[model samples]
Target: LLSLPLVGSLPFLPRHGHMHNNFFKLQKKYGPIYSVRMGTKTTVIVGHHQLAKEVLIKKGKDFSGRPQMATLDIASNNRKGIAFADSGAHWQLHRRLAMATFALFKDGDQKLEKIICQEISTLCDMLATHNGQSIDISFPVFVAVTNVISLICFNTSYKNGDPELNVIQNYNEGIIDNLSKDSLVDLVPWLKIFPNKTLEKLKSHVKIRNDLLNKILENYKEKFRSDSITNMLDTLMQAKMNSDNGPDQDSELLSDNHILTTIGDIFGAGVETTTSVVKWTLAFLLHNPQVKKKLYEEIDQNVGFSRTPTISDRNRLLLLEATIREVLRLRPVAPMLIPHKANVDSSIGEFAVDKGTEVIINLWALHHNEKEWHQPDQFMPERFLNPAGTQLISPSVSYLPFGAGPRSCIGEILARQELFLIMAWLLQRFDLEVPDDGQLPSLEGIPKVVFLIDSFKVKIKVRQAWREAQA
Candidate 1:
């Protein structure tokens, strides 16, 4: 283990921005697996693909645990959600319920394609209003992406000018701004006893967000019929009622807090990362016009402007699929996944990890390592494509944008469908270009919980064929 001043060699301390890069620098100095002391915490940083598999997959049980964080405690009502829940029966039940709910929604009568198509069409209509001018695409993208989650959870969609959308956006932004991988309170629990403005603000945001969700939950319960299971929220309500009515009768097992926090988790996880991915994909396409043209050509050839592309068409659209994969490879949504905790004494590779040790897989390091990828820094979609460029190459061990193993993102299927459909529909109708000012947008942004791009404008023009296809 290495030691520094008060913060030790903890990469997330003091200079917390560009933290993923800092971890890579540390990996260069300390090798793939090393320890850093953060006050009372002993954090084991894993910066390689092979070792990450060992930790997250090989020793899945030991490393599947989540470390408690003050921010999560405040935001989730003392770690009530699946995302932050410690590995136990409660977590297992929640995970099971979440998986089942997602499966139900994906294959539901309402249909994932229909839900996303309407939202995407609405988004295109909104973009058309700007009429080929430069505009910040964040709000429209956020609403369209978030509405998918809303429809699944509450059987509702937020219109472009809905105040509820702004409420959701504002609260989520405030919560993420305060949460970090290495909060002082998380490192030293004693520090949380002191008054902190950031924590207070986070609490306030959590309350407002929860209150809004709570209102929805209450209404769902008020009119909820066991015979009619409409959405995920309805499913959750039934699950709660089942537990309540069961002979075992353990209220704490599925508390109101758990249901509330679970809904919050779905909303928080579903919205921002997907929106950022869409934005980054656009930025990359703008940065590399060759890629944009190739994608356009692929879409033109396979699924023309006359009809919308379905996820079923993903297999045929290899270049478009490869392009999205490349964007995720070059710029992942979450560079460092939420830290996993060692439930018991464990050994990762040759290194011994003690019980309660926090283990982080530096996804950025693994994604950008020269040892794993050819021309690791370049944005090359063709790398993911086969020699014939007709199919996508199977992802290697190093590719883990959604993470891996038992704890990999539960929303992977949904997110993939959304990305494929949204991008395909947009490229079919609109030709996106960098603004006429000749200023190229920087790919990198200030790293918050998720790395995000700064606000930038794009000039989009309607595809001539798209206008004709309508007739």
Candidate 2:
């Protein structure tokens, strides 16, 4: 990249290609760790997993802060929520709250699995309703995945084509398209002075979304009662009241504003990744029928058509789990996690760093590093399995799909469990394939902030084993 006299490398900052693609391409020329100056500000990126671990895990206290930008601050409501919050007291509290909230339904009462399974059953029926036709499921999958996460959030979800569902999805889609934290509006502060419709649209969508949720949340709080606290609203509120007592046990931190922001993030962040990855996996499965055959065999032999697959069948369904691991490695949801800001002066490996410098962990480059991954472009789930195929083993410490350290995704285990159950049940019931008239779903992805599989069509049919059993 060409650096100008005063602007430095600002002139050569990525102009085209996917954001991560440009960064990974630079890794070939700039080595593992490189910094590009955008005038006065310096943005540093690290590609190797070792350096990533060092920056993200080992020295996280110094490096886990989010970049100081008005973009996220505006959307995240002054950076009070998890993904965008700067590392400190408030971030820690919110993270802990989400951690415990996720645990209550998952491990404590065991309601999370049942909730997820019910959604999966509904999704199966929805797909089966298509009657072996080729339909584009990109949006449908998005809605289905949305419903699953929503159940945990508010205990209610809109059915497909429901007017309420359309508005939520439409508004969310608008927000995602315009909520570019790195858009020029933030990159060049002066750009914000102008009448930018993109920013305006984002503000509009946020208002619309909040008003709708505000109503639900208001009503929910008024009538909130629980014997077991099955859904998220019930549990989180109870958790809040319980902790709102005693000295040294500070409460009042988890306010309704935090709850609303957290719920907002849950819908936006949660649905995007899960929905996209499922599509990516389906694309890969279509491209690799042999792998799908073995995956189906594992599920059938273990759980069968007699019942839907559950988290209890996890260890037995190792292949499906490994396949998901491979997809994540191939395409990390946040190819470059929301860039980390240096809270104190620090160095990544031998590189020099200064307080307030931005750090981007290039997970894409690390996942595809030939040094750690043999034939890195090849989609191989066996890389995550052992010799006898009896257990799942990560081939490299380099592969941190959910990332690592204190700022790492808190929803990691819940995501894994939810994904396993969803995939297992889907594979157990259907033979999903490229329609004869249509082409294979592309493995290549486009970014909507989080990477997404380019949408494609699939023909789904009930499996012969399941059909036979039904008869």
Best by TM-score: 1
Candidate 1 off by > 4 Å: 1-13, 106-108, 181-196, 246-250
Residue-level lDDT of model 2, residues 1-471, one tens digit each, is 995665233423544666676677877777888887656788887888889999888998889898766556656777877788888766887677677767667464348888778777888888898868998776776777788788777768776678877787788777777777332223345435666676677778888887887888888877788565666677567767777656235355567877778777778788877877888888899999999999988888888888788788987989898999999999888887778889999889967899999888888888888889989899999988998999999798778888888788887876887778778888988889889796987777776667867778999898888888875
- Give a tens-digit lDDT track for model 1, residues 1-471: 996666233345645557677778877677988876756788887889999999888888889898887667787688787888888876777777878777765565578888888899899988998877998899998999888898888888876688988888899889888876332224335346666687878888888998988788777677788998767777777777787763344457677778888888888988998998888888888889998898889899998865788888998998888888888888877787878999999899977889998888888898899877888999998898778898778556798999987788989988898998999988998979989996677897657777788778899888888888776
**lDDT of all the models against the reference?**
0.82, 0.78
Model 2 quality (TM-score):
0.91
Q: How far does residue 68 in candidate 1 sit from its true spot (Å)?
A: 1.5
